[PDB]
From a paper:
The 14-3-3 family of eukaryotic proteins are abundant, medium sized proteins (~30 kDa subunit mass) endowed with a well-characterized phosphopeptide-binding ability. The human 14-3-3 family comprises 7 isoforms (β, σ, ζ, γ, τ, ε, η), that form all-helical W-shaped homo- and heterodimers. More specifically, 14-3-3 s bind protein partners that have phosphorylated serine and/or threonine residues presented in a specific molecular context. To aid structure determination, we have developed a streamlined approach based on chimeric 14-3-3 proteins fused to the sequences of interacting peptides.
Unexpectedly, structural data obtained for the pCH3 chimera were significantly different. Most crystals produced poor diffraction, with the best 3.9 Å resolution data set collected from a crystal with two trans-interacting dimers in the ASU. The electron density maps of two neighboring subunits belonging to two different 14-3-3 dimers were clear enough to trace the C-terminal portion and the following peptide and to conclude that it binds in the AG of the adjacent subunit. Although the distance between the C-terminal tryptophan of the 14-3-3 core and the positively charged residues typically coordinating the phosphoserine, was too short to allow canonical phosphopeptide binding, binding of a phosphorylated residue was still observed. Surprisingly, in both cross-patching peptides, we found that it was the second Ser residue of the linker (-GSGpS-) that was phosphorylated and bound in the adjacent subunits’ AG. In one of the chains, we could trace three residues beyond this pSer, LRR, indicating that the bound peptide had a completely reversed orientation to those observed for pCH1, pCH2 and other known 14-3-3/phosphopeptide structures. This clearly exemplified the extremely rare case when a peptide phosphorylated by PKA at a non-canonical position (N-..pSXXR..-C instead of N-..RXXpS..-C) was then erroneously accommodated in the AG of 14-3-3 but in the non-standard, opposite orientation. Interestingly, in the pCH3 structure, both 14-3-3 dimers adopted a significantly more open overall conformation than in the pCH1 or pCH2 cases. Surprisingly, in the pCH3 structure, the open conformation of the 14-3-3σ subunit did not prevent binding of either the sulfate ion or a phosphorylated peptide (yellow).
Author numbering:
A (entry chain A): 1 to 74, 78 to 235
B (entry chain C): 2 to 72, 76 to 231
Write the structure that this text describes.
């Protein structure tokens, strides 16, 4: 089907490293109104993650230049171009959130995929929050907070504390608390709690999941080590 | 203004947004001012990166299209390889379009005129790596007549150790071996360019010593690979 061609082409774009095209093919495939398989969700995620990743990296470089020029010692061209990048980035996030709302979230049946999409919804509102400045910041921060909270409530009632999707979601929500909401204590606390609960349930894991789950637990410990300790 | 476009192209280079860098350089060229040394290099980088990425992707796809013949396959591969091919053609046409009105006709000195006439030969050569039909011959010839006019405002204007003149000869020899499939002419041109620059090494200054020997390295590499 039209859908089978779009999926095949998205795989070719991944191999050709044409992520903008990969995103477009996955968008079109979603729009066929079929549920995404596990492999397909990951193709969708990779496409948009790469696209937004590049825009965020560039925005940081430009924002950094804009700030080092307003400092003691050292034209409006920097602001104009930083705004262009910002606007482009917003377009991508709005597109992603538009797809999750109409129609990935409301269209998913089982709990695993419902959590995956809500986590993605928090992730993309969090990306919008990284750049937002006005009265709009607060609303956006809150829409990311509810997407993550709704995903957390489902994962607690439907998944074991060692499930990698659950661990991934908690890890991102804690990063959101530290960096976005600027609630470092809540971030540290959520991270430790998630770790210790998964830790108590390690013995119940099968061989293949233990690798995936300990890898995410490594990321939680890394953040905890960073958030609780200096240098010098 | 032109000053803003130039400044923005520099920012895009730092943000690695080459598509945007190309667009800013195009706009700045269109002001009708001559490009300084720094500016020509921003223009060459901006389009080289863009086209480089498209060529690399086309090769990957063309390779997959050939490995599927024997024998999911489907027409999807061809459909997408054609999309990439078409996109690439648009870029080359844009480059050559301003390398015509105006860049080589707008330049006064010989170094600058050679730079643009090398670039024109380079972008026609790119159009060939994709073209196959009755069109493959015309394009090869437009790259050829561009490289020969460039090969003559070089031997008669620049020393045999000049890096621009070495760079141009290196590319024209690659055009003979790979595109025109005249391996003998390629080998001959390469060896000649090498040995003439070799005789004049002692006359080089400290800073040019590095740049010129580097090009001569790519010419002793090619000649120990091709033969």
């Amino acid at each position: 089907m039209e859908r089978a061609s779009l999926i095949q082409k998205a795989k070719l774009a991944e191999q050709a490293e044409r992520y903008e095209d990969m995103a477009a093919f996955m968008k079109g495939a979603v729009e066929k109104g079929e549920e995404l398989s596990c492999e397909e969700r990951n193709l969708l995620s990779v496409a948009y993650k790469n696209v937004v990743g590049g825009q965020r990296a560039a925005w940081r470089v430009l924002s950094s230049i804009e700030q080092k020029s307003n400092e003691e010692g050292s034209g409006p061209e920097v602001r104009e171009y930083r705004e262009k990048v910002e606007t482009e980035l917003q377009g991508v996030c709005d597109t992603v959130l538009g797809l999750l709302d109409s129609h990935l979230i409301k269209e998913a049946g089982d709990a695993e995929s419902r959590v995956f999409y809500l986590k993605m919804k928090g992730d993309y509102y969090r990306y919008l929050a990284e750049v937002a400045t006005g009265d709009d910041k607060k609303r956006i921060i809150d829409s990311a907070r509810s997407a993550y909270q709704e995903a957390m409530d489902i994962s607690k009632k439907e998944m074991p504390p060692t499930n990698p999707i659950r661990l991934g979601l908690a890890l991102n929500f804690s990063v959101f608390h530290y960096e976005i909401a600027n609630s470092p204590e809540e971030a540290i606390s959520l991270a430790k709690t998630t770790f210790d609960e998964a830790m108590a349930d390690l013995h119940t894991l099968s061989e293949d999941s233990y690798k995936d789950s300990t890898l995410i637990m490594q990321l939680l410990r890394d953040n905890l080590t960073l958030w609780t300790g200096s240098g010098s």
